[PDB]
Amino acid sequence: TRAGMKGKVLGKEKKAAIIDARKKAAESRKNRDDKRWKRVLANMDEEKRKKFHGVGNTAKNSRVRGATRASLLKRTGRKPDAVSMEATIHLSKLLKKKTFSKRAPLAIKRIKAFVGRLMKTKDNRIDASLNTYIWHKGVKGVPGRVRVLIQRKSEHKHFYTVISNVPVASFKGLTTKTVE
Amino acid sequence: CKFEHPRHGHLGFLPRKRSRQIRGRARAFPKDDATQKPHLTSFMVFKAGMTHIVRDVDRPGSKVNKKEVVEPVTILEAPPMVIVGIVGYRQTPVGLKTIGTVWAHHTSVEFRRRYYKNWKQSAQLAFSRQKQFANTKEGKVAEARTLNAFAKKASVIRVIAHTQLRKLRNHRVGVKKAHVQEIQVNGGSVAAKIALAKSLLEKEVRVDSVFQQSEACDVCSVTKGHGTEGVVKRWGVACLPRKTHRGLRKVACIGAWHPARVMYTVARAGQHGYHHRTQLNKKIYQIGRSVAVEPNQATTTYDLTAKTITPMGGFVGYGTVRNDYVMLKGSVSGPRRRVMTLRRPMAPQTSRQLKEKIVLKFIDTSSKIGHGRFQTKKEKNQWFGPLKKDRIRREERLR
RNA sequence: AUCGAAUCGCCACCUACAAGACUGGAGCUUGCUCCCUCGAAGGCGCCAAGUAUAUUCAUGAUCACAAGACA
RNA sequence: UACGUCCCUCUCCAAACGAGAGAACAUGCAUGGGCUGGCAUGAGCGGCAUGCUUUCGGUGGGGCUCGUCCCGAGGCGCUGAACCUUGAGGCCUGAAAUUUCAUGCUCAGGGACAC
RNA sequence: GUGGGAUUGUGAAGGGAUCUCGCAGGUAUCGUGAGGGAAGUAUGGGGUAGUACGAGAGGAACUCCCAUGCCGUGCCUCUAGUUUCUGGGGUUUGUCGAACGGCAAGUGCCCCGAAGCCAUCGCACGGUGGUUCUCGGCUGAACGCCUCUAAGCCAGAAGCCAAUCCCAAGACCAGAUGCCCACU
RNA sequence: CGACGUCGCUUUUUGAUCCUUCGAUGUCGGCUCUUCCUAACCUAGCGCCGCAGAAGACGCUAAGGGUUGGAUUGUUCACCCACUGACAGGGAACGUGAGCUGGGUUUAGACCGUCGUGAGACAGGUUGGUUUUACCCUACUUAGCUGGAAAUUGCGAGAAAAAGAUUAUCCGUGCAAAGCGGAGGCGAGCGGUGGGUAGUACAUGGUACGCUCAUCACC
RNA sequence: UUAAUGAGAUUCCCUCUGUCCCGAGUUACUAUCUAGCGAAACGACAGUCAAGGGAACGGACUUGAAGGGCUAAGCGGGGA
RNA sequence: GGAAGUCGGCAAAAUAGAUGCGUAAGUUCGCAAGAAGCAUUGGCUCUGAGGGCAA
RNA sequence: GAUGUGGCCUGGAGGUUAGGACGAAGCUUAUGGCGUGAGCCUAAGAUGGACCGGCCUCUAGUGCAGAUCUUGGUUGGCGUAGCAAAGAUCUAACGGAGAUAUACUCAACAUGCAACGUUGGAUACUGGAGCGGGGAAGGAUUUCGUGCCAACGGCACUCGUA
RNA sequence: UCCACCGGCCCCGAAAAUGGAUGACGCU
RNA sequence: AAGUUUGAAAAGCACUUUGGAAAGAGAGUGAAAUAGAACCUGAAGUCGUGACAAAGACAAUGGAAGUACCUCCAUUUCAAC
Ligand SMILES: [K+]
Ligand SMILES: [Mg+2]
Ligand SMILES: [Mg+2]
Ligand SMILES: [Mg+2]
Ligand SMILES: [Mg+2]
Ligand SMILES: [Mg+2]
Ligand SMILES: [Mg+2]
Ligand SMILES: [Mg+2]
Ligand SMILES: [Mg+2]
Ligand SMILES: [Mg+2]
Ligand SMILES: [Mg+2]
Ligand SMILES: [Mg+2]
Ligand SMILES: [Mg+2]
Ligand SMILES: [Mg+2]
Ligand SMILES: [Mg+2]
Ligand SMILES: [Mg+2]
Ligand SMILES: [Mg+2]
Ligand SMILES: [Mg+2]
Ligand SMILES: [Mg+2]
Ligand SMILES: [Mg+2]
Ligand SMILES: [Mg+2]
Ligand SMILES: [Mg+2]
Ligand SMILES: [Mg+2]
Ligand SMILES: [Mg+2]
Ligand SMILES: [Mg+2]
Ligand SMILES: [Mg+2]
Ligand SMILES: [Mg+2]
Ligand SMILES: [Mg+2]
Ligand SMILES: [Mg+2]
Ligand SMILES: [Mg+2]
Ligand SMILES: [Mg+2]
Ligand SMILES: [Mg+2]
Ligand SMILES: [Mg+2]
Ligand SMILES: [Mg+2]
Ligand SMILES: [Mg+2]
Ligand SMILES: [Mg+2]
Ligand code: NA
Ligand code: NA
Ligand code: NA
Ligand code: NA
Ligand code: NA
Ligand code: NA
Ligand code: NA
Ligand code: NA
């Protein structure tokens, strides 16, 4: 980042103070607009009120007009050193039109990269079950989807992941979950 | 003493280099007529996609007179622009020089992000000192002096306009920093131009205030890019016979012995596409309102079905047209999502075709994914009826 | 703040303009006569702020980039 | 010194590589759901029955055992079903909807210049 | 002056001295437009009209306006081509004991196939002012008269030049701007 | 249009010469592609005819644009079919072979005719007969980075700028007018950013606006 | 003169087709970028043009006109 | 569209197995001949025919 | 093309004079001086380590820029052309110096990459006219075990017909 | 004043292929 | 092809340190390790590095005259000179 935003230059306190200042500015704008739009909508007529659609956060199945979605995210804090999640990877979207004799090794590399980005880990080990599942229709017959179990662990502190196959009958309706 | 044919390509579009900018920029404006009312001459739009229309033709003598025709059209989304500044130009023996800029008292975040590579992590100081200064009495005097200089020395007045990407709530147009262009004010005296521009300051301008429905416009845009291309595609030269040693898709002779060098008129491989073009005489077939105000965008007097300008499944790679838009007859240079400039026409608008009043009878809104055969989702629903998944949904509803 | 320099005419009167087969003005006789601002100077500047009763200059020693220069 | 710029990172209107357009905790990315579309009716099971559809309707040229229950390409039903649908990179979380999106990941961005 | 470096090759440690370099610009937009490139070009039909001319046979052209060649620049709505989305089916031989899932035949082969790319195989768009030639005139001498020229003028070609269009500041733009810094 | 005479011009023919190249400048045609010329076929204007009209002849300015598809032939030339507004003529190392192609030509094999006693010959016919190399420089096409006006240096100062105690000692307007109008501190003014509140406006999440408390600056 | 035979030479017809009109799309391996490895040919000196003369076709000479430096991918006009 | 390409159908496309039917000129009577052409072939469930040993 | 030169230079010989460990020859030079020049001479080596200069005469395999010159070395091109037939590898554990290799800040990503041999598992190929199992010719220790990776195995190696 | 004839300078006669050459600019 | 021609003696670099090793940094021997092993001298050419000179594009080199800056060079002068 730029010099005036570097962690090692500002230090913890100043970085936190600048961060809270930006947040409180955005928050002041959000609350002012919230109050202004609520009262302006209230003192308006039914023809106009319906004319205005979901401005003052009135419509259902909508975002919050006031702020960003990420600013509404509750930051639970530090994830533990040891953590396990189950996730689908859409492999065919990554392997489309790839040379047929490269499909399975490419799938291994794409899975390693996917998990490494997810877990901030460069040591990403493939369990025998996942490698067997990926290769079980030969080099060019990689399945379009795979459900993997990701287990990060520690042994400075060194983090590595173990990725194993999760056999599933269907992929429909499966999202990413945390497993203990 | 040989067989003869014309050369390949137009030497007036040289060099075939990548355009300096991605935005379409007018290199000239229409001749200024002081007898007309002051008016803006340009507007920035975004290409969403294409469809086709049916209309009846009013052209006596033609074999299609009083007959239906179908025309492909291009849909360009036109959210309103915001006027943020005034610039004046004085004429000198070495060309136009700008006298100065009168900035608005308040600018959008979108306009100010245009001054940054990384806005979110920046100090965000753009125009802060200017605001604090112009707000005062010395700043008010400096603004008055700049405006008086415009009145005294300017022959040309332009406004600084920028686009609103927040209102263009498009998910594939990733850019959040506003596009900025100078829009020339034509018509009236210089004082009248300055008055119109001063009234326009910090205000929103809609595309229907610059253009009218049945008129034509010129389009400044950059063409789709293809990277490095060979002479066959880039220039249209013939392919060589199958028997040719070392390759067929090339120019056999790139020159005579003398001059003992290669001329600039010989076709070579290189950049193709991503060029700026000006593309005059595009007829405006419709200036639509945003769907949140008028949702029956594609409804005509002959097709009463309520539908929007967005085809079933959306414009491919673009999404929904959420704002005001312009329906242009035919095609325009450049891909979807690319910002383009509509300019008031420079060619004479006195032909029968260019004056013709356009009345649309049908606007196709079928799916642009795969041979769309339904105009609306209700038409598809009444073709298929209850499917299995709808029955499951109702089964869940009853429990 | 390096930095020592080469350059030696200033101006708020030239720093507007046009014509050279007609240049200040007339006349009728049209190339001569009569009038004038009389047709060939941009203003200063060159050692007393002004034309005179003055007043410090050395030895920087007989040439040397003027050893000095906001006129 | 400060603004800031670039690299790492992410996207694709760019693209041989440079360069470009962008983003910088952002519905940004991921995975689901819905839409839009493609193909053409999946596996399994079954034959007037606890099956299918809402009172109806329910095979097969032949063949084999002891009227029944077996083998049999194919057919019918559940079933416009099953699967695929963004990826070099379709749509929807900002018009309305018999439904019109849901979730979870990010937890002080790192580095170098500017100097 | 300030700072940072360094001298020539035979040890070490301190002193000078002398060189050299930095000491003011960065970064982000909008524009100008000198110079260069340069592009549109043909045919037909309607009507004029079966008329002007002509004994008659025969037999025209422009205002206009309707198309079409070629060339040029693009585009992908449609139609067409293309498929390693090996998408969904189907089908042969072999093969995992069978069904299933498939797999091998360097994409097995066959039908259909989105997206993208793409065809005068599809669709869109292609503009205005000067200045002259050849030549015809006006006024008008030389030279009474005359004369188109000799001094002046006028009209004037798909020519030339500029506009529009493409690149564009080594064309070094004291063009205008945003923000830091330096100067102040 | 032009006898018989006479004067030119041009290097798109062939001859004449033998100056360059024999320690090698790839050799016909076609294909592809670009450019140039005009002695103009078509396209634009204009004169003139024996010019009634239509069709044409001849000339002038004009080279901006255009000038095809095929049968036989290695062919260039030709001449036949057809289209067309027209199917003009030339140059570029008889443009163009590390661009191709290799039909012809021009080695070695072989057949014929003629010639020769013969080996063999033919300026005659016939058939078969390796087409090599670019990663260097320039040129051209695209594609990046980057100094620089004393074209790197001098400190060597020139604005298609303003107009004044010599640009200092205010701001506006006006003709480079005449004048005319504003311009130790506290408080005030004017504003930038935050609280409270109140409509409204704009395309409607996000800015502006009236009142008050806070701070900040400049005056 | 000859049936049969022929990787012999020639002409025509049916079929067929990207040979062509007139090109377009896809694949593998390259080129391309990276790690490791790493040559040769060739090499007077060098490389922007116009005209002129000149051993009668100059990169150097005369007179003009251009030319900021350094680079990546190509390309076959010239380097007779 | 179908050789208009090209010196020249070069290259490529095309034909295709098996079975039945059918097959010209010419001829050294052997051939020509797979001349040319026409048709049929899957999967299932069956039926027929084609044998050997012993009393 | 001819000729001259108390003209220059080199290896040896007869003479005569000198020099050298307090530094000969050789070699280096912004290292000056002298000569029209061939060259000579000095200086300095922060060079060297043992021979050698001048002058007269004698003598010769006696002076180089080029011969598609001979031999050796170097060199731009150039980190370039390229190392593309024979389809192909993946995964864990073990072994190994071959790593999880770090200044401050820093939880891990964004600061040690890339590559190995063995075993297990997976995937594929050869497809009996075989990268199967044995012989002649030819080769002659390449066979086997242990060890070891300097060179060689046009990349790599912990492996090897080294 | 016009008739013929003869000089000077200028003009016509006077068309080629990369953009170009009294050496260049220019000179009346 | 190829002189082993280190040095007077092998006195052929113990020992420390880090590196897997090769080696590096120290320390020793020696008059001298630019005498460290096929090691005397160690040229040219080519290359690296530090300091400096600058320098558009006139290919570079070259001539002649100056000038700016340098000069581990030579020579001369330094007072009745
Ligand atoms: K490499
Ligand atoms: Mg693209
Ligand atoms: Mg060939
Ligand atoms: Mg002086
Ligand atoms: Mg990509
Ligand atoms: Mg909605
Ligand atoms: Mg398609
Ligand atoms: Mg397979
Ligand atoms: Mg030669
Ligand atoms: Mg040669
Ligand atoms: Mg040659
Ligand atoms: Mg060749
Ligand atoms: Mg060839
Ligand atoms: Mg042959
Ligand atoms: Mg034969
Ligand atoms: Mg044969
Ligand atoms: Mg083709
Ligand atoms: Mg290459
Ligand atoms: Mg030349
Ligand atoms: Mg030469
Ligand atoms: Mg070449
Ligand atoms: Mg033919
Ligand atoms: Mg032909
Ligand atoms: Mg063939
Ligand atoms: Mg017969
Ligand atoms: Mg026959
Ligand atoms: Mg048959
Ligand atoms: Mg001689
Ligand atoms: Mg000897
Ligand atoms: Mg000799
Ligand atoms: Mg010689
Ligand atoms: Mg390479
Ligand atoms: Mg196999
Ligand atoms: Mg074998
Ligand atoms: Mg190796
Ligand atoms: Mg002269
Ligand atoms: Na120009
Ligand atoms: Na299609
Ligand atoms: Na198809
Ligand atoms: Na005979
Ligand atoms: Na190159
Ligand atoms: Na020599
Ligand atoms: Na390779
Ligand atoms: Na010692």
JSON list of C-alpha atoms (C1' of nucleotides) in Angstrom, two decimals, chain D residues 5-6 9 15 19 23 30 32 34 51-52 55-56 61 68 75 78 90 95 97-99 104-105 112:
[
{"chain": "D", "resi": 5, "resn": "U", "atom": "C1'", "xyz": [2.86, 5.76, -8.26]},
{"chain": "D", "resi": 6, "resn": "C", "atom": "C1'", "xyz": [4.32, 0.77, -9.38]},
{"chain": "D", "resi": 9, "resn": "U", "atom": "C1'", "xyz": [-3.37, -9.70, -5.55]},
{"chain": "D", "resi": 15, "resn": "A", "atom": "C1'", "xyz": [-3.79, -8.61, -24.70]},
{"chain": "D", "resi": 19, "resn": "A", "atom": "C1'", "xyz": [1.16, -2.05, -22.71]},
{"chain": "D", "resi": 23, "resn": "A", "atom": "C1'", "xyz": [-10.99, -2.97, -8.83]},
{"chain": "D", "resi": 30, "resn": "A", "atom": "C1'", "xyz": [-17.12, -18.75, -4.01]},
{"chain": "D", "resi": 32, "resn": "G", "atom": "C1'", "xyz": [-26.14, -22.60, -4.05]},
{"chain": "D", "resi": 34, "resn": "G", "atom": "C1'", "xyz": [-34.21, -18.77, -9.71]},
{"chain": "D", "resi": 51, "resn": "G", "atom": "C1'", "xyz": [-48.35, -47.60, -9.34]},
{"chain": "D", "resi": 52, "resn": "C", "atom": "C1'", "xyz": [-49.64, -43.27, -12.46]},
{"chain": "D", "resi": 55, "resn": "U", "atom": "C1'", "xyz": [-63.71, -40.83, -11.95]},
{"chain": "D", "resi": 56, "resn": "C", "atom": "C1'", "xyz": [-60.79, -42.98, -15.63]},
{"chain": "D", "resi": 61, "resn": "G", "atom": "C1'", "xyz": [-43.64, -60.96, -31.70]},
{"chain": "D", "resi": 68, "resn": "U", "atom": "C1'", "xyz": [-50.80, -69.01, -12.45]},
{"chain": "D", "resi": 75, "resn": "G", "atom": "C1'", "xyz": [-43.23, -50.03, -25.61]},
{"chain": "D", "resi": 78, "resn": "C", "atom": "C1'", "xyz": [-43.89, -41.75, -12.84]},
{"chain": "D", "resi": 90, "resn": "G", "atom": "C1'", "xyz": [-24.89, -15.50, -20.13]},
{"chain": "D", "resi": 95, "resn": "A", "atom": "C1'", "xyz": [-39.20, -1.39, -12.03]},
{"chain": "D", "resi": 97, "resn": "A", "atom": "C1'", "xyz": [-43.82, -10.35, -9.94]},
{"chain": "D", "resi": 98, "resn": "U", "atom": "C1'", "xyz": [-48.66, -17.05, -7.44]},
{"chain": "D", "resi": 99, "resn": "U", "atom": "C1'", "xyz": [-40.55, -16.69, -6.06]},
{"chain": "D", "resi": 104, "resn": "G", "atom": "C1'", "xyz": [-20.10, -17.47, 3.59]},
{"chain": "D", "resi": 105, "resn": "C", "atom": "C1'", "xyz": [-15.05, -15.85, 2.75]},
{"chain": "D", "resi": 112, "resn": "A", "atom": "C1'", "xyz": [9.21, -1.19, -3.34]}
]
